[PDB]
Amino acid sequence: EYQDKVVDVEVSLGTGFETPMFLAMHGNFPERIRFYVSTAGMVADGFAVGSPAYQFATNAFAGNFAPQRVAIGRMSIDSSKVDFTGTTEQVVVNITLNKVVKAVKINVPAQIATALADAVTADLTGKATAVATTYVTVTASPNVVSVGKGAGVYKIVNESSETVATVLPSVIAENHNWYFLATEARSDADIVAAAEFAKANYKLHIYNSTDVDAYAPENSAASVFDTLKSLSYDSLGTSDAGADVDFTEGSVIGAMAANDPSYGDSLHLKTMPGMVPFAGSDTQRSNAWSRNANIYRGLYGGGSYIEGKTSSGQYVDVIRFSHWVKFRMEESVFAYMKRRSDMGLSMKMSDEDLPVLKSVLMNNPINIGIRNGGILTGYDTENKVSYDPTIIIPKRANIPTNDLAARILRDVKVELVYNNSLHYVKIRASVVLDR
Amino acid sequence: IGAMAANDPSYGDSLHLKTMPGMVPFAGSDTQRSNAWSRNANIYRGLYGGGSYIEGKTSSGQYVDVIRFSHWVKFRMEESVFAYMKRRSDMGLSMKMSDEDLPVLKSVLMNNPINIGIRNGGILTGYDTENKVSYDPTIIIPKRANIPTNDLAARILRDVKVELVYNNSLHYVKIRASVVLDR
Amino acid sequence: LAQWQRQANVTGLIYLPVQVEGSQGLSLNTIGWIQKQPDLSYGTEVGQMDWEIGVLDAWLSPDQIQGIAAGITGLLGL
Amino acid sequence: MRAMERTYTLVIGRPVVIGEKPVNIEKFANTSKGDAYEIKDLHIEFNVKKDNSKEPNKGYVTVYNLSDEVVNYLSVNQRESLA
Amino acid sequence: ISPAQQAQADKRARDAAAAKRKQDTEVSNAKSREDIQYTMFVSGLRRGRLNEFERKNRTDDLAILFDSVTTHTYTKDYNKSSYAVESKAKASDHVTTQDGKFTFSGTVTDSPYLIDPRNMIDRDTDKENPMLARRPAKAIEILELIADSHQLVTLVTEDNILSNYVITSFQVDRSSEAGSSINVQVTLEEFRFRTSDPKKAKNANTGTKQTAEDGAVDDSAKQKRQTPYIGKNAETKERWENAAIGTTD
Amino acid sequence: NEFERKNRTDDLAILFDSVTTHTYTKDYNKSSYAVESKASDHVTTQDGKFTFSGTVTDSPYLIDPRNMIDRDTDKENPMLARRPAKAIEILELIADSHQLVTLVTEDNILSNYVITSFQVDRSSEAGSSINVQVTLEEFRFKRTSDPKKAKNANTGTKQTAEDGAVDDSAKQKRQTPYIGKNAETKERWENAAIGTTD
Amino acid sequence: ISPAQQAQADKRARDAAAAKRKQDTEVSNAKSREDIQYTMFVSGLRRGRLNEFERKNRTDDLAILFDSVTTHTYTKDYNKSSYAVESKASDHVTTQDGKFTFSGT
Amino acid sequence: NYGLTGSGFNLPPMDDLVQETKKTFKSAFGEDFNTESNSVADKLIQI
Amino acid sequence: QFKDLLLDPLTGDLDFGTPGDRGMRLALTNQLSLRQRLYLRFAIWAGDWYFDETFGFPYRTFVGKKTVKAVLDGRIKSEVRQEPDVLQITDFQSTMDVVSRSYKCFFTVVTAEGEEISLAFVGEDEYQYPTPPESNVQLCGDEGVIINFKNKLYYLINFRLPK
Incomplete structure (x- = not known):
């Protein structure tokens, strides 16, 4: 195009893997998924300050390893509630028609509950409705309405007729460049359904639960964590009082996103901004530990996470590594087959071409792992075994004739050893004196 | 003409921003200049703290410095081959279409026109990382087993092919930045 | 190899x-x-060209040969 | 382009004679021949101290490889005070 | 000479002067940032010392890696005094320790094998087009900035870790023997030794102090003009300062 | 990109037939006594040095005329042009006049460098050519001028300036006769108001 | 600047200062006790020097052995007046301190 | 200093006026105000 | 924290503000100050500003000449780091088109935010000097001491009875 300057300078702002997806309840756009780079964009989309999605996004962008670009899922709303089962100024924020920012105010729970409903009616009342029942329900008419917490102790509780188990198959179709999965419903049925979906699609599930049963005595299995443990599901659960209201899921995601899985970076002692220390006693913490329910603890002169143990039992950093190995090994072999088949020289099961896979696999996935410290190497003095990766390929004299008809190669095997981090240290000493 | 004359065509010297004494700046507005640009009608413009030409685009569309280079290649390639044929024919040993003497043209053409182009920066050379092709000049000559008998009667050699890549100058630059702050 | 070089x-x-x-x-x-x-050497017969290819690691691996893991643990030494 | 190089000049004049009016060393620069003995391009080392006290300010100088004529002119006037 | 030649003379002054401004200001920026530390990984990276290379964030803790380090050496020295006795022999007296010196040699190649982005040299190097990234050049303007700004370098060697070392000299040789690479040698020596809480601060000293040079009374000495006031709250100030402070006259 | 900027009258450029090695080095020094403690000011910077070796041959391979060595060299008979003698004549003049040379190198560009020594020899081997070595060091350099840029200056004590009508008397030179372009107006006033040196 | 850097410059000063407290302290106590006696065994060992090697305990008479010693040299020096003596005046000579050096691995 | 004095009329250079007015601007908005090279206020004041 | 007149990022003129609050503004946030400090530094061609011959960027060296992309990027990336408050440069996508002969690069710069040291020169004050009493309240007491006690008694009577 015609350029009217020899130089044009614009000074402006703004602009396993990183991007998380937060499955929220709202109607601010028709699509099922949208990407954002800052909380500012979500405000322009009619997200009220204090709203569930807003809390997650602001928490995720504040971490030391914040993701580059978050994603918001959409599940329909039918009604929303404001619960006042605790009170002292109880400012609330409402946005209607995408522009009407009416920050309702009230001061001093039925009185406040009814008082808040009365204040809303005093408004634009021609576009939204309110009614007290302790809690007060707020309903839109065909108008985008957003309700969020401004102050006080109340907590927002959105409700929807749609079910998470059915929406997730929908969001994936639109786009799938997202790895972390988080949900707002946080009911026992909703959480479990989300956990099962993450398995078949190889996604990492995260959830914070306010259940008091989390740190109940170990013999008592009543919390969600017990159900997932029984089903052997991998989902990074944890217990926090701010799990609602603030949706601290973003804080945890904020510590892992901008960090390549090949480094094997443990999540043991990292600090999560936004979270609040766990105040339970020593016995309670031991109980929760048996549950695989991680806790954020205020440590000696500080506060930090405790352990990245998933519900099944394996440390989280292992799970990301295992997924990262799956993805890269799959793309690397495919990327080579295309080249051969695109030159007319497609690969053949001739036993003279199969061995080439030794170099292809050792090249992209394996070596990159060693240079980053993810994969161990060397020798063991007590087990007397070496840690070097090994690869074995079957010869044409073993492939059953059934496979040759279907042109399938199976039973290839690979071996790896993972580099384990350090979590605890326990000194022991004894001051004996000479005689 | 005063800005291009005393300048060998092999250097590929662009005429983009040179200053022309005597001319007066074009006073039209921004919209007018955009209109004239679509016409391939170059304008002398008074620039930031100065005045200079804008672009050497001919009526067809190609930049002017290319056209001089293309003509300069035509002339030198033509004289160089002829200047060699005379020598052979003037020693009694005139060139023959024997397929044992044709290949010599590899050295004659690479000698006078092509190499002088590379030493002056006119012709590119090297390799390309995304197209995966090289920029080295290539020359292809047909063998006696392909020349039709009609040409042998007329003693004509045709269908020789040569390849070159031109070194493009720079005309515009457009910066883009964004001052993001840590959190 | 020439093109690669x-x-x-x-x-x-x-x-x-x-x-x-x-x-x-x-x-x-x-x-x-x-x-x-x-x-290169163009002569009466067909010539031979020897490419020197340098390699990072030059430790030979038994790999296909079987019964090596057991044998390694058999050696004594102090 | 040049560098930043040093330069200097040294002048020798007639003997100083005190009279009945203020003495100005300026007017004694010219020699009987007119122009004075100027020395420009010869390695020179000098040290000149100055102060605010009774004693006069004194300075020391050294010159290498002077022409015989100039040295002869100073062999004479050894009883006198050249400016 | 000619009037046109005056323009040519002016170019020399500007371009030559502008060159030192870029170098001088950049050096001035160093020695002003105190939250920056430079570390050089001479060796040991692949044996144990990998733990320290992970702690550096490319923003305030920076690591210097070299494509190859041919040799490194460490030599401490001591001095011994001696006095003579009437027995036609010599005795000894106290001794002293003379700091310590470290040197090493390395090479930066224009065809790297291990391009790790965490290394501060490879901040902008292109992954797939290394030779055009000008690695050999990119190392000189960063090594020179460290030395001429008098940074206190920390060396992470395989044998031990050294701190408070100051670079003294370095070399860069593009000999025809190798080409496409630079041979680098460096030497270092041990430089052995406001804000903040009032509790920890102790009695300081500043010596004799003259009139402040940023306000009036210096103008009367420098023979300049007093700055007029900005009017706000007039008739309240002027009555008081004019009576309690007066004017410098 | 910058070699083509050099013209044949102001920005002269020099190219050697071959350069074998060039080295660049800087030095620093520090106090050898333990400091009192941060007292990081106990260090100084020296001038960087640059040296290289080259050669000039009677049988050049590239005779690009932009090089100032090849100002007027014959195209077909390079050895009769006596190129090595052309280079030396240029080299001594640059060093003798103390020019602030600019070096364009592989990696960086250096400016304000002066030549302190060079060597030339013609050994039995490599006949018809000369080996050349050069050494350079940094220069920490610090009228018709715009009055807006002028600054108060000084010249110390001054005496009678130049051989004038009064300085001539001091040296006993005879007064310069006045050219009689006009001797009617100034004469009555010149002697009455300015007088004569006597 | 920002307070985030002030919380970073302190770390740079604190950790660096901690290094002297480690190295500087160890030498102080090492000089505050004269009981310990260090010894070095350069060659010698197998030609009957084992008689005294076994005397060394692990607390007071510490011993050091290198994996290999290639060469060791011992030398003494003397000096005399360079002017003719007055004559016997054999006192015109002095003894210097003997030097010892070796290389190991 | 440079205006009317007891010994006739004097002339000020440019730099003294520049420094005086820059000091005035500094006083206007505190010691933190920028007035060199890159400031729009600098380009206005010098012109 | 360098203060200066605010330049509109959208038009390049001074940011006089919206039609409802037209006026003049100073650049206060470090982000805004650094934006214009880079903009002016890159927009002024080297040597074209009188009173300072050394300021600006030398575009004439590259524009109109056959130049290497790698050399230009170094100079572009170097001018940025002349500011003393630049933390780092994140990414740099330098691309060149040979057909149109245009060059266009992208990159971002990260800078922190500081404190205000003193508010004396800007607007407001942070202290809360007391308010003089009214009428005979000081010498005889205040009625609020009765109102608060009455309210406490009423609320306590409210508390005990279950509700």
Whole structure:
């Protein structure tokens, strides 16, 4: 195009893997998924300050390893509630028609509950409705309405007729460049359904639960964590009082996103901004530990996470590594087959071409792992075994004739050893004196 | 003409921003200049703290410095081959279409026109990382087993092919930045 | 190899994988590069060109040979 | 383009004679021949101290490889005070 | 000479002067940032010392890696005094320790094998087009900035870790023997030795102080003009300062 | 990109037939006594040095005329042009006049460098050519001028300036006769108001 | 600047200062006790020097052995007046301190 | 100093006026105000 | 924290503000100050500003000449780091088109935010000097002491009875 300057300078702002997806309840756009780079964009989309999605996004962008670009899922709303089962100024924020920012105010729970409903009616009342029942329900008419917490102790509780188990198959179709999965419903049925979906699609599930049963005595299995443990599901659960209201899921995601899985970076002692220390006693913490329910603890002169143990039992950093190995090994072999088949020289099961896979696999996935410290190497003095990766390929004299008809190669095997981090240290000493 | 004359065509010297004494700046507005640009009608413009030409685009569309280079290649390639044929024919040993003497043209053409182009920066050379092709000049000559008998009667050699890549100058630059702050 | 050498000189990428699968013998698997171009010699017979390819690691691996893990633990020493 | 190089000049004049009016060393620069003995391009080392006290300010100088004529002119006037 | 030649003379002054401004200001920026530390990984990276290379964030803790380090050496020295006795022999007296010196040699190649982005040299190097990234050049303007700004370098060697070392000299040789690379040698020596809480601060000293040079009374000495006031709250100030402070006259 | 900027009258450029090695080095020094403690000011910077070796041959391979060595060299008979003698004549003049040379190198560009020594020899081997070595060091350099840029200056004590009508008397030179372009107006006033040196 | 850097410059000063407290302290106590006696065994060992090697305990008479010693040299020096003596005046000579050096691995 | 004095009429250079007015601007908005090279206020004041 | 007149990022003129609050503004946030400090530094061609011959960027060296992309990027990336408050440069996508002969690069810069040291020169004050009493309240007491006690008694009577 015609350029009217020899130089044009614009000074402006703004602009396993990183991007998380937060499955929220709202109607601010028709699509099922949208990407954002800052909380500012979500405000322009009619997200009220204090709203569930807003809390997650602001928490995720504040971490030391914040993701580059978050994603918001959409599940329909039918009604929303404001619960006042605790009170002292109880400012609330409402946005209607995408522009009407009416920050309702009230001061001093039925009185406040009814008082808040009365204040809303005093408004634009021609576009939204309110009614007290302790809690007060707020309903839109065909108008985008957003309700969020401004102050006080109340907590927002959105409700929807749609079910998470059915929406997730929908969001994936639109786009799938997202790895972390988080949900707002946080009911026992909703959480479990989300956990099962993450398995078949190889996604990492995260959830914070306010259940008091989390740190109940170990013999008592009543919390969600017990159900997932029984089903052997991998989902990074944890217990926090701010799990609602603030949706601290973003804080945890904020510590892992901008960090390549090949480094094997443990999540043991990292600090999560936004979270609040766990105040339970020593016995309670031991109980929760048996549950695989991680806790954020205020440590000696500080506060930090405790352990990245998933519900099944394996440390989280292992799970990301295992997924990262799956993805890269799959793309690397495919990327080579295309080249051969695109030159007319497609690969053949001739036993003279199969061995080439030794170099292809050792090249992209394996070596990159060693240079980053993810994969161990060397020798063991007590087990007397070496840690070097090994690869074995079957010869044409073993492939059953059934496979040759279907042109399938199976039973290839690979071996790896993972580099384990350090979590605890326990000194022991004894001051004996000479005689 | 005063800005291009005393300048060998092999250097590929662009005429983009040179200053022309005597001319007066074009006073039209921004919209007018955009209109004239679509016409391939170059304008002398008074620039930031100065005045200079804008672009050497001919009526067809190609930049002017290319056209001089293309003509300069035509002339030198033509004289160089002829200047060699005379020598052979003037020693009694005139060139023959024997397929044992044709290949010599590899050295004659690479000698006078092509190499002088590379030493002056006119012709590119090297390799390309995304197209995966090289920029080295290539020359292809047909063998006696392909020349039709009609040409042998007329003693004509045709269908020789040569390849070159031109070194493009720079005309515009457009910066883009964004001052993001840590959190 | 000649085209690869020219390309490597022009751009800079010189490292490519090298694998040799021996028969009833030791094998190799590492990353190599082109060291020295051989010398042509047009004569009466058909000539021979010898390419020197340098390799990063040159430790030969028993791999295909079986019964090596057990044998290694058998050796005594102090 | 040049560098930043040093330069200097040294002048020798007639003997100083005190009279009945203020003495100005300026007017004694010219020699009987007119122009004075000027020395420009010869390695010179000098040290000149100055102060605010009774004693006069004194300075020391050294010159290498002077022409015989100039040295002869100073062999004479050894009883006198050249400016 | 000619009037046109005056323009040519002016170019020399500007371009030559502008060159030192870029170098001088950049050096001035160093020695002003105190939250920056430079570390050089001579060796040991692949044996144990990998733990320290992970702690550096490319923003305030920076690591210097070299494509190859041919040799490194460490030599401490001591001095011994000696006095003579009437027995036609010599005795000894106290001794002293003379700091310590470290040197090493390395090479930076224009065809790297291990391009790790965490290394501060490879901040902008292109992954797929290394030779055009000008690695050999990119190392000189960063090594020179460290030395001429008098940074206190920390060396992470395989044998031990050294701190408070100051660079003294370095070399860069593009000999025809190798080409496409630079041979680098460096030497270092041990430089052995406001804000903040009032509790920890102790009695300081500043010596004799003259009139402040940023306000009036210096103008009367420098023979300049007093700055007029900005009017706000007039008739309240002027009555008081004019009576309690007066004017410098 | 910058070699083509050099013209043949102001920005002269020099190219050697071959350069074998060039080295660049800087030095620093520090106090050898333990400091009192941060007292990081106990260090000084020296001038960087640059040296290289080259050669000039009677049988050049590239005779690009932009090089100032090849100002007027014959195209077909390079050895009769006596190129090595052309280079030396240029080299001594640059060093003798103390020019602030600019070096364009592989990696960086250096400016304000002066030549302190060079060597030339013609050994039995490599006949018909000369080996050349050069050494350079940094220069920490610090009228018709715009009055807006002028600054108060000084010249110390001054005496009678130049051989004038009064300085001539001091040296006993005879007064310069006045050219009689006009001797009617100034004469009555010149002697009455300015007088004569006597 | 920002307070985030002030919380970073302190770390740079604190950790660096901690290094002297480690190295500087160890030498102080090492000089505050004269009981310990260090010894070095350069060659010698197998030619009957084992008689005294076994005397060394692990607390007071510490011993050091290198994996290999290639060469060791011992030398003494003397000096005399360079002017003719007055004559016997054999006192015109002095003894210097003997030097010892070796290389090991 | 440079205006009317007891010994006739004097002339000020440019730099003294520049420094005086820059000091005035500094006083207007505190010691933190920028007035060199890159400031729009600098380009206005010098012109 | 360098203060200066605010330049509109959208038009390049001074940011006089919206039609409802037209006026003049100073650049206060470090982000805004650094934006214009880079903009002016890159927009002024080297040597074209009188009173300072050394300021600006030398575009004439590259524009109109056959130049190497790698050399230009170094100079572009170097001018940025002349500011003393630049933390780092994140990414740099330098691309060149040979057909149109245009060059266009992208990159971002990260800078922190500081404190205000003193508010004396800007607007407001942070202290809360007391308010003089009214009428005979000081010498005889205040009625609020009765109102608060009455309210406490009423609320306590409210508390005990279950509700």
